[PDB]
Amino acid sequence: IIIATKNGKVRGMQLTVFGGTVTAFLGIPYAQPPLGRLRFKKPQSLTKWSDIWNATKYANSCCQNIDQSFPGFHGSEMWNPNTDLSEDCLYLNVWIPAPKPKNATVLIWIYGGGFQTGTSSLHVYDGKFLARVERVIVVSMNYRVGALGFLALPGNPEAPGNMGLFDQQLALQWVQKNIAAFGGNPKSVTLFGESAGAASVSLHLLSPGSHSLFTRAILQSGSFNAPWAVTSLYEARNRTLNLAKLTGCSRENETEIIKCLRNKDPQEILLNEAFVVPYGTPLSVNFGPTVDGDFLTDMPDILLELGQFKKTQILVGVNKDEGTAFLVYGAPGFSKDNNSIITRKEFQEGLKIFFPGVSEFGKESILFHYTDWVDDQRPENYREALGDVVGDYNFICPALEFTKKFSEWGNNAFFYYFEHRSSKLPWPEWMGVMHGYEIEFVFGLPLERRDQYTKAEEILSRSIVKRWANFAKYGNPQETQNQSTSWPVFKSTEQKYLTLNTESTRIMTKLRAQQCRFWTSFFPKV
Ligand SMILES: *[C@@H]1O[C@H](CO[C@@H]2O[C@@H](C)[C@@H](O)[C@@H](O)[C@@H]2O)[C@@H](O[C@@H]2O[C@H](CO)[C@@H](O)[C@H](O)[C@H]2NC(C)=O)[C@H](O)[C@H]1NC(C)=O
Ligand SMILES: *[C@@H]1O[C@H](CO[C@@H]2O[C@@H](C)[C@@H](O)[C@@H](O)[C@@H]2O)[C@@H](O[C@@H]2O[C@H](CO)[C@@H](O)[C@H](O)[C@H]2NC(C)=O)[C@H](O)[C@H]1NC(C)=O
Ligand SMILES: *[C@@H]1O[C@H](CO[C@@H]2O[C@@H](C)[C@@H](O)[C@@H](O)[C@@H]2O)[C@@H](O)[C@H](O)[C@H]1NC(C)=O
Ligand SMILES: *[C@@H]1O[C@H](CO[C@@H]2O[C@@H](C)[C@@H](O)[C@@H](O)[C@@H]2O)[C@@H](O)[C@H](O)[C@H]1NC(C)=O
Ligand SMILES: [O-]/[N+](=C\c1ccc2cccc(O)c2n1)Cc1ccccc1
Ligand SMILES: [O-]/[N+](=C\c1ccc2cccc(O)c2n1)Cc1ccccc1
Ligand SMILES: *[C@@H]1O[C@H](CO)[C@@H](O)[C@H](O)[C@H]1NC(C)=O
Ligand SMILES: *[C@@H]1O[C@H](CO)[C@@H](O)[C@H](O)[C@H]1NC(C)=O
Ligand SMILES: [Cl-]
Ligand SMILES: [Cl-]
Ligand SMILES: [Cl-]
């Protein structure tokens, strides 16, 4: 019940899972709270404590704006924070099997949310099932988001940028120094994350200072070469200054600006973040990772191109309908409460929404590539096209390209295509296999027979949980006992990937080949 860590004793709590027991340590601090003069700075190391820290409840989530578009709707509200917001939020969680393992592979989850939302306490991030079923230790951490976590005056230590990434890195360090006390193997640590979490993982592969803090990596629906994932130093400054103006904090001393933003209450900073950009999109990441020269020494697309990353195995994948969710946060004619049949006209307006600073030619080129129909009289033609445009540009093609480029340096890569729509999915059917709705399967929620999943979903989750754990433990995401499809390595020539569904698991080649040539070879010129 009580574990000695290098900063003090922490008391956990016991959980009944599937007629077994898991020990949960919820809300262990891993940094000095970034308050007062510490706001915007890199996380500071923790001063020891002499008591028994009671790590029995999730801690505060980090300050963040909340999605209020669909009040009372579980489909959107399941992602909103479920603990008090506070700047005091640098805490982490540990689930360890009972009885205490001896040298367990460690899984470290990094949540997504566009670098502006998210929290490790979400129901769908509960590591108790993975600990019970696979005897891995699961660790998750809160990290600062938004301007509080990514405001950047590059070079300036009062706000160097990438603080949220250093939050995560400091947590990986805590696991290196402390997880053997919990029965974990610090030499067998697999990072996994979804969306901005997955982009973060991919950046830890690139950041020299994280190379000794983990073994292997899993990237779900996200990678750093996604167009929303890195802010340029131009944008990052223009956005910092705009925030200064919106808060009456413009100064000439760049340091005095920060000093002024440090006296602002968190709500005022939060309220102004949306407007630092002239034209946002539903995919806007106004404050995110930048080339700071510390966590990131060069523009990441160059490091990836020239093999400057940790050499190891990766497991990468995407969902069938990553794009659809964003279409009801601003695309015209769209709604979660109807079939969202849209006209050609509405499709073109939608592109203006999703590609606001893109020229008329570029937008026409997106239209051209996605509107050569198999049947021009199918009315969902344009609704589906816009979802795929957003999905292919923002998630699927960057992840495939990351996997091609990373595998070209000799490392084993595994790619999956998740195409199961949860039987409990509260969004409408036209949105399909949405962004984020593989997470419950990865965490083994369908293993709980009491929670209204089909038996088919329990079998799919159980297989996915095995492949993930085998990947973490052995670098190979196979299910070796139940006559399962073998998951082949991804190679830049053949480009084989594994489809994950309840019906049949299949091996296919060259996912979204035509679409991604447009997005990765032509569209970056416009
Ligand atoms: C860089 O910043 C300027 C300033 O942004 C404006 O003011 C901020 C405080 C905030 O409220 C933003 O929403 C504002 O747009 C941007 O310049 C503006 O650009 C728009 C259209 O591009 C124009 O209509 C405004 O008049 C401009 N205002 C000023 C003061 O110049 C600029 O677009 C930003 N981005 C880039 C890439 O330079
Ligand atoms: C699907 O609904 C959208 C959204 O409209 C809102 O939500 C509906 C469920 C309903 O409660 C409406 O009263 C709401 O206004 C519709 O988009 C609207 O379309 C009308 C006419 O085309 C237009 O006046 C509005 O500006 C549109 N609102 C937008 C674009 O945000 C859409 O037409 C509906 N489509 C189908 C096929 O039913
Ligand atoms: C930390 O917890 C100690 C033991 O708490 C015991 O177990 C928990 C689960 C509760 O059921 C509680 O009622 C029990 O007493 C406390 O003795 C101690 O005071 C706590 N420390 C702080 C700082 O709150
Ligand atoms: C725990 O294991 C250490 C070696 O780790 C090995 O390599 C990593 C990459 C994983 O694949 C893991 O499964 C392997 O066991 C030992 O050096 C260490 O002494 C062990 N500690 C124990 C047994 O308490
Ligand atoms: O983008 N926003 C919401 C969003 C995006 C993607 C999703 C994918 C799956 C399910 C969802 O509920 C999703 N919700 C709005 C919003 C943006 C930034 C801060 C606060 C709020
Ligand atoms: O708000 N949520 C997601 C969100 C918001 C804004 C984004 C902007 C750019 C890129 C993104 O991936 C974004 N994702 C909720 C949510 C969290 C995790 C999984 C599913 C849904
Ligand atoms: C003002 O800027 C100078 C450098 O231009 C810096 O050394 C100084 O610390 C700033 N003022 C304060 C009060 O920190
Ligand atoms: C393998 O099949 C058995 C039933 O024959 C099932 O109980 C078990 O959960 C399966 N294991 C995996 C990893 O899917
Ligand atoms: Cl498809
Ligand atoms: Cl082929
Ligand atoms: Cl082309």
Ligand 5 atom nearest residue 436's Cα = 9
Which two structure tokens, joined as six digits, stand for 180? 């053997």
Tell me the backbone φ, ψ of residue 50, rounded to 5 degrees.
Answer: -105, -15
Q: Could you tell me the residue ranges of all domains in the chain?
A: 2-325+392-515
Rounded to whole angstroms, the Cα distance separating 171 from 91 reads: 8
Ligand 4 center–CA 173 separation, angstroms = 18
Which DSSP string do the residues of 324-391 spell out, in sequence order? GGGGGTT-TT--TTS-----HHHHHHHHHHHSTTS-HHHHHHHHHHH---S-TT-TTHHHHHHHHHHH
Spacing, Cα 385 to ligand 10 middle (Å): 24
Residue 101 vs residues 94, 143, 154, 181: alpha-carbon distances, Å: 13, 27, 43, 10
**275 in ligand 1 pocket by Cβ < 6 Å?**
yes
Fill in the DSSP letter of residue 493. Answer: T
Residues with a known catalytic role: 195, 322, 435
Nearest to 106 by CA among 468, 477, 487: 468
- How far is the centre of ligand 11, averaged over its atoms, from the C-alpha of 517 (Å)? 6
- Kindly state if the Cβ of 242 falls inside 6 Å of ligand 1: yes
Asked if residues 40 and 157 have their Cβ atoms less than 8 Å apart, the reply is no
Structure tokens at 383: 């609704």
Cβ < 5 A residues, ion ligand 11: 518, 522
Q: Is the CB of 68 under 6 A from ligand 7?
A: no
8 Å CB contact between 395 and 322: yes
157 lines ligand 7 (CB under 6 A): no
114 assigned ligand-binding residue:
yes
* Ligand 1 in reach of 238 Cβ (< 6 A): yes
State which amino acid sits at residue 499.
T
Resolution of the experimentally solved model in angstroms: 2.5
Closest atom of ligand 8 relative to the 479 alpha carbon = 13
Cα 472 to ligand 4 centre (Å): 13
Helices in 78-151 by DSSP H: which ranges?
Answer: 128-134, 146-150
- 8 A C-beta contact, residue 225 and residue 401: yes
Dihedral class, residue 107 (left if φ above 0, else alpha if ψ from -120 to 50, else beta): beta
Rounded Cα–Cα distance for residues 156 and 151 (Å): 11
CA of residue 440 relative to chain centroid, distance: 14
Distance between Cα 98 and ligand 3 center (Å): 21
Structure determined via: X-ray
Query: At residue 121, what are phi and psi to the nearest 5 degrees?
Result: -80, 0
Q: Which ligand is nearest to the CA of 253?
A: 7
Residue nearest to ligand 2 atom 9, measured at CA: 337
User: Which atom of ligand 2 sits closest to the CA of residue 332?
Assistant: 30
Fold of the domain built from segment(s) 2-325+392-515:
Rossmann fold (3.40.50)
By most ligand atoms within 8 Å of CB, the mutation choice from 78, 117, 223 for ligand 6 is 117
Q: Whose CA is nearest to atom 1 of ligand 7?
A: 253
Q: How far apart are CA 39 and CA 163, in angstroms?
A: 10
- What spacing in Å lies between the alpha carbon of 154 and ligand 10's midpoint? 45
Q: How many CA within 13 A on the CB side of residue 276? A: 28
**Is 110 strand, coil or helix?**
strand
Whether 116 lines ligand 5, by a CB cut-off of 6 Å, is yes
Please indicate whether residue 462, judged by its CB atom, sits closer than 6 Å to ligand 8.
Answer: yes
Could you tell me which of 500, 348, 411 has the C-alpha nearest to residue 205? 411
Tell which residue, 214, 407, 213, 395, has the closest CA to residue 314. Answer: 407
Element (H, E) at 77: helix 74-77
Residues in contact with ligand 3 (CB, 6 Å cut-off): 11, 54, 56
Query: Which ligand is the nearest neighbour of the Cα of 136?
Result: 4
Tokens of 438: 């593989």
CA of 420 to the centre of ligand 8 (A): 19
How far apart are alpha carbons 204 and 354 in whole angstroms?
28
| Ligand 8 atom closest to residue 466's alpha carbon, by position in its atom list | 13
User: What are the pocket residues of ligand 6 if the criterion is a CB atom closer than 6 Å to any ligand atom?
Assistant: 67, 79, 112-114, 117-118, 194-196, 228, 283, 285, 435-436
SS (H, E, C) 202-242: HHHHHCHHHHHHCCEEEEECCCCCCCCCCCCHHHHHHHHHH
435 is in an annotated binding site: yes
From first CA to last CA, the distance across the chain in angstroms is 59
Closest ligand to C-alpha of residue 223 is 6
